[PDB]
Every structure is written in C-alpha cells, then in structure tokens.
Enzyme design. Structure first.
Site, PDB file in Angstrom:
ATOM      1  N   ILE A 189      51.618  58.744  28.573  1.00  0.00           N
ATOM      2  CA  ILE A 189      51.833  59.177  27.204  1.00  0.00           C
ATOM      3  C   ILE A 189      52.973  58.381  26.548  1.00  0.00           C
ATOM      4  CG2 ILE A 189      53.476  60.934  27.843  1.00  0.00           C
ATOM      5  CD1 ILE A 189      52.353  62.653  25.585  1.00  0.00           C
ATOM      6  N   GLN A 223      58.187  62.724  21.890  1.00  0.00           N
ATOM      7  CA  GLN A 223      59.464  62.158  21.492  1.00  0.00           C
ATOM      8  C   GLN A 223      60.285  61.903  22.739  1.00  0.00           C
ATOM      9  OE1 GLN A 223      61.279  61.130  18.757  1.00  0.00           O
ATOM     10  NE2 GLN A 223      62.640  60.625  20.454  1.00  0.00           N
ATOM     11  N   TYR A 224      60.609  60.646  23.006  1.00  0.00           N
ATOM     12  CA  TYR A 224      61.402  60.344  24.185  1.00  0.00           C
ATOM     13  C   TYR A 224      62.835  60.863  24.083  1.00  0.00           C
ATOM     14  CZ  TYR A 224      57.682  57.300  26.036  1.00  0.00           C
ATOM     15  OH  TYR A 224      56.503  56.807  26.550  1.00  0.00           O
ATOM     16  N   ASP A 225      63.488  60.638  22.947  1.00  0.00           N
ATOM     17  CA  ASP A 225      64.869  61.094  22.761  1.00  0.00           C
ATOM     18  C   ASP A 225      65.344  60.897  21.324  1.00  0.00           C
ATOM     19  OD1 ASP A 225      67.851  60.767  22.552  1.00  0.00           O
ATOM     20  OD2 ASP A 225      67.753  61.355  24.668  1.00  0.00           O
TER      21      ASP A 225
END
Ligand SMILES: Nc1ncnc2c1ncn2[C@@H]1O[C@H](C[C@@H](N)CC[C@H](N)C(=O)O)[C@@H](O)[C@H]1O
Ligand SMILES: CNCCCC[C@H](N)C(=O)O
Length: 423
Positions: A189, A223-225
C-alpha cells in the site's frame, strides 16, 4: 500482470491470507506496485490481515537459526541480517515475497555522486551522508562479528549493497507505531496526500483498514506520516510532496565551552529543558519554535548582562530570556542568524527562480526530488532571514530588562516626607 507477482499472489492464497473478503488485488501503478480495489471499499473497511506467522521483526529473527547469534544486537541490525539471509535461502518462507521487493528506491541513500550534486549545499545532503556512513560502520562490524564467524549460517558473502538494500527495505517498508515490523502484504500500500487521519495499524495478525472510501478500480492509500518534512520523506522513502508546509530546515544552537559563562549558562539551559546542544526544526509558514529566541539570547548573553546568571534570578531568568535582555543582546543574535541564513543560501548552486522553472517541465524522480527539496530549503532560509530582518527594524519596540525594571518605580507617588516626620 507479472510472473514473480502472480506467483506472489498465489502464495498469499495458499496461506489463508487472501480469501474472499479481500477487496483488493495488486497492480502496476505510477508509484511502483500497489493495492487496487476489486470492489468498492468503505472507510475503515478491513482490507487485509496477515498472520503474525509471516512477520519479519526482532521476535521472528530471535526464533530463527540465527536468533542466537543476534541475541545482543540492536533490533534493526538483527532484522538487516535476517532479511539478507532469508533472501538467499531458496527454501525461505518468503521466497515469493523477495521476488517482488524492489532492488532500489529513490531514497537518497542510493543516489549517485552526480545525482547527489543536485542537492549541493542542502541540509538533506548532509543528513544523507551521515546516515550512509553510520550504517556502513555498524554493518561492517556485523560482518566481522556475526557473518564471517558463523560461516555456517551465512554461506554466501555480504556486500554493502546488500546491507543498504536491507536498510532501505526496513526504513521505507516497516511500520513504526504499533516495533519495527514488516508485513509482506501491507508492504504494498502506497502513500497519498489524500489521507489525513494516519492510523491504520491494528491487531495474532496485522489488521489494515483503509482510511478512505475507494471505488472499484482505484488505489487504496494511507498516510505515512503527517509530521515528517520533505527532507525526511526523501530519505525514508523516495519521494516528497508539493505541499510547501512540508518544507523544513533545522537550526542547531549550542553553548560553546569557550564561552566565559559556560557553566552558568548550561545550568540555566538544563534547568529549563534544553541541553548544551539544541535542535530547532523550522517549518515553512509555521511560527518559530518556543525556546529558540530565549536560547539564542542565552547564547548571545555577554558580559554586560551576565548579572542575570546570578542565583538571584535562577527562578526568573528564563522568563527574562523570553521577554528579552537588551538591545545589544537582541541586535547581536539577529545579525548572527541573518548571516547564517545568507551564508547558507550562498551554498546552493541554483536560484529559486531556476528551481521553479525546472519544476515547470518533466523531471526524473530523483532530480524532481532534489529540486523540490532545495527550493523548499531556500524558502525556509529566506523566511527565517526575513523574520529577523523585521526584528532588526523593530529593534526598539521591545522593552528590555532595564526598562522593564523601572516601569514600577512610582516616581509620582505622594509627599512621603509628611508622614516620615510624623514619627
Ligand atoms: N506517494 C508516493 N509517491 C511515490 N512513490 C511512493 C509513494 N508512496 C509510496 N511509494 C513507494 O513505495 C515504496 C515503499 C512501500 N511502502 C511500498 C512498496 C511499493 N509500492 C513497491 O512497488 O514495492 C517506496 O520505495 C516508494 O518509492
Ligand atoms: C508499507 N510501508 C509502510 C509505511 C509506514 C509509515 C509509518 N512509519 C507508519 O508506521 O505509519
């Protein structure tokens, strides 16, 4: 789609992972490989759930043949080896998984020397080098302490390339908040700026829930970060965002030991949450971090205002630092900052105008990254300089220590002597 991929998809099936309530398949997307919904998917709708039987975290390495030798190694160093090892084993439980893993990413840790030249003068270049070096040492010490000794568990040689390979894999794929776990399925993903919730980890298995309502045919993102800068995204993964609010530049302040008031200053700093060395991250359009100004004033202190380092003020010193010390103190720190910004700005090889024109055409992913990063850093640098430029103008609108002390003087009180003679 792909022999290695189609084979990988079969593997997950012959594991109970992908059954029928799995509304998603793999496909070739601009960002590599991703998960494309086979049917509509709703918010928080579960997408995948891999059984812990398939992780690749410290616990899984501690339970393998090399679990003994890596008994006292740092968590990541342990997984690096595990990954390199299983990557060679033709009887590995992830044989198909590895046949899918990208050999490289656009992380700066893989850039050529020419590619790196595009980041000339940038804070990101510095950060990348440091990290590359570190990983190198830590990895070479591993060869001579765990790989060469146990020439039984590691038949084949181990190059830096393989080391950086695993480091990259770890830093661009693993999931932090749950500690450095990896999931063969969820590892596909991708990231999108569409997601603004950040929170898809849950759990023995790994439960991934789509934070958005994807329609069939579309891609499932996460959303990774939200708090990483573009410099951080560039090193951790191989990408950045156009969002100007992601641009940041960190300043490093310190109380030099050569400072004649070192001991007293360090005492003031530590008594208030700051060390001998402090790092302040400055994001674009965001207000200066609290503590930056007072720490700058402490650094610039000087002989005239040294009386503030006396026991008498140890309880209010920081408060004074936050309000301001004196015009000479303020004026000194402003010039210091402004020169540092100009000095830095002069280290880049392109103007912001040139960067912006380049962005107006088609750019190779790595070049696009360098251009966006260097442009951003210049915006931050220029913003910081502008902020202090105003400050140099309003240099007299601030009420310094002295003036603040005489505010409550009561010159115009009463004719005290009339009472003084009444006793
Ligand atoms: N928004 C994005 N833009 C470009 N690349 C991305 C994005 N989100 C994730 N990636 C890529 O996905 C990788 C990290 C993994 N999270 C996903 C695996 C990746 N989809 C693959 O095909 O192997 C990184 O190497 C990135 O290059
Ligand atoms: C498949 N890659 C996963 C990205 C992980 C992003 C971040 N560290 C997190 O824990 O959300």
């Amino acid at each position: 789609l792909s022999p290695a991929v189609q084979t990988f998809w079969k593997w997950l099936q012959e594991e109970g992972v992908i059954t029928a309530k799995t509304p998603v398949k793999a496909s070739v997307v601009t960002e590599g490989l991703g998960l494309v919904a086979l049917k509509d998917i709703s918010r928080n709708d579960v997408i995948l759930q891999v059984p812990k039987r398939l992780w690749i975290n410290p616990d899984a390495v501690a339970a393998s043949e090399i679990g003994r030798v890596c008994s006292e190694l740092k968590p990541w160093l342990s997984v690096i080896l595990f990954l390199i090892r299983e990557r060679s084993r033709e009887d590995s439980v992830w044989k198909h998984y590895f046949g899918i893993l990208p050999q490289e990413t656009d992380s700066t840790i893989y850039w050529s020397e020419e590619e790196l030249q595009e980041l000339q003068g940038s804070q990101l270049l510095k950060t990348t080098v440091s990290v590359k070096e570190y990983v190198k040492n830590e990895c070479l010490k591993l060869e001579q302490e765990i790989i060469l000794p146990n020439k039984r568990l590691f038949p084949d040689p181990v190059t830096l390339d393989d080391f950086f390979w695993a480091f990259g894999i770890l830093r661009s794929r693993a999931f932090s908040r749950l500690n450095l776990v990896v999931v063969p399925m969820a590892d596909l993903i991708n990231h999108s700026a569409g997601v603004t919730t950040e929170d898809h980890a849950y759990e023995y298995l790994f439960s991934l829930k789509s934070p958005l309502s994807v329609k069939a045919g579309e891609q499932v993102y996460i959303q990774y970060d939200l708090n990483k800068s573009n410099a951080e995204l560039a090193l951790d993964y191989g990408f950045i965002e156009p969002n100007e609010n992601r641009h940041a530049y960190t300043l490093t302040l310190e109380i030099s030991e050569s400072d004649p008031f070192f001991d007293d200053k360090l005492d003031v700093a530590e008594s208030n949450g700051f060390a001998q060395t402090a790092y302040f991250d400055i994001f674009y359009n965001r207000t200066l971090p609290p503590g930056l100004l007072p720490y700058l004033r402490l650094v610039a202190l000087g002989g005239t205002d040294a009386f503030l380092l006396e026991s008498l003020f140890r309880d209010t010193i920081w408060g004074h630092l936050e309000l301001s010390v004196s015009r000479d103190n303020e004026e000194l720190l402003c010039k210091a900052v402004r020169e540092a910004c100009k000095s830095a700005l002069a280290g880049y090889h392109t103007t912001i105008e040139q960067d912006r024109e380049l962005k107006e055409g088609n750019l190779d992913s790595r070049l696009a990254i360098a251009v966006g990063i260097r442009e951003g850093e210049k915006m931050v640098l220029q913003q910081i300089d502008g902020i202090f430029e105003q400050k140099e103008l309003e240099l007299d609108q601030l009420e310094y220590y002295q003036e603040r002390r005489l505010k409550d003087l009561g010159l115009c009180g009463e004719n005290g002597d009339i009472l003084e003679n009444l006793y």
